[PDB]
Design a protein around this ligand. Structure first.
Ligand SMILES: [Cl-]
Ligand SMILES: [Mg+2]
Ligand SMILES: [Mg+2]
Ligand SMILES: [Mg+2]
Ligand SMILES: [Mg+2]
Lengths: 194, 194
């Protein structure tokens, strides 16, 4: 029923643009919307990937590996799933494993990969694949993992037990002035609601 | 260690602005970032998203979701009921109001998150995620009628909690819709909790 009529540029940057979107509502009335888009998207299925990294070790509870970084748009520190943009020609799966190794040092194995999902659809067209990855923490390659961050990336790794994720995240927030990512919190809520 | 040095406006709109953020990295090097902000914040957060658990005796619990055309995405999206918090409104009151508006259901607050980030590599947008139970056997929830505001066109989709991820994957396979990343994260964790 509803569809895009046109997209007028309002302002471009090196990395992000703002657009005035004209669209047809279900009554036949024309309406407008201010939309944000990244400038970097190619023939990728999505802008980025987020990795759900499940650290598995014998005689240990499973952990979910997360990353803490300063995020300039937020003006503060955020706790997130390891994540980044998909390179031109890279598969979501390869980007997931690469970004996980870069940001955390862990070498994972693909478990599953989502279709493209929207980050904030009332505001942007940004999409990711959410890729679930198991990390064999008993393999020697994952013994003392060293991050290989790229230029301008500064990451601290935080691994929290899956069986208590939400309480552990609430404790971090109580002690240390930082924001939890909405996908991380949604995941933690569902672990409790199950 | 890291902090904001300055924020240059690049373009404002009625609802969204684009900013060049200058910040200090942990090595003492000055760097820049293109950031998006909403112009509407007054509030603990921009918005709320509601996790509505429809509970009816002798039925599977359902998660109530909404399908809407999203102009930034150029297509239809499946999301938790959600909207912006009004000036002076508590997150909890906004959650119950937006849930009744978008779905017709009258719920009860179960829990409320701290402010969580939507896409911290890109914007400063935040929400409270509010978990709400809906007593589907109460007569008030028998024949619920949405009361959408101006420009809101919502289809309500209830899916069983015990099979949410498979049900969402099936919708995506049959219908060309995008699932919201928080919805998908929640659905994954329902499966991963085993
Ligand atoms: Cl619940
Ligand atoms: Mg990253
Ligand atoms: Mg990275
Ligand atoms: Mg609304
Ligand atoms: Mg809404």
């Amino acid at each position: 029923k509803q569809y895009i009529i046109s997209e007028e540029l309002i302002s471009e940057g090196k990395w992000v643009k703002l657009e005035k979107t004209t669209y047809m509502d279900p009554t036949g009335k024309t309406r407008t919307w201010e939309s944000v888009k990244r400038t970097t998207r190619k023939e990728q299925t999505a802008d980025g990937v987020a990795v759900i990294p499940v650290l598995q070790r014998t005689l240990h509870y499973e952990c979910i590996v997360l990353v803490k970084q300063f995020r300039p748009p937020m003006g503060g520190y955020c706790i997130e799933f390891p994540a980044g943009l998909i390179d031109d020609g890279e598969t979501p799966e390869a980007a997931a494993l690469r970004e996980l190794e870069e940001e955390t040092g862990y070498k994972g194995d693909i478990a599953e990969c989502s279709p493209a999902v929207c980050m904030d659809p009332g505001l942007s067209n940004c999409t990711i694949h959410i890729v679930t990855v198991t990390i064999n923490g008993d393999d020697a390659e994952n013994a003392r993992p060293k991050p290989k961050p790229g230029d301008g990336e500064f990451v601290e790794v935080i691994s929290l037990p899956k069986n208590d994720l939400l309480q552990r995240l609430d404790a971090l927030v109580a002690e240390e002035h930082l924001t939890v990512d909405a996908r991380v919190y949604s995941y933690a809520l569902a672990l409790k609601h199950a």
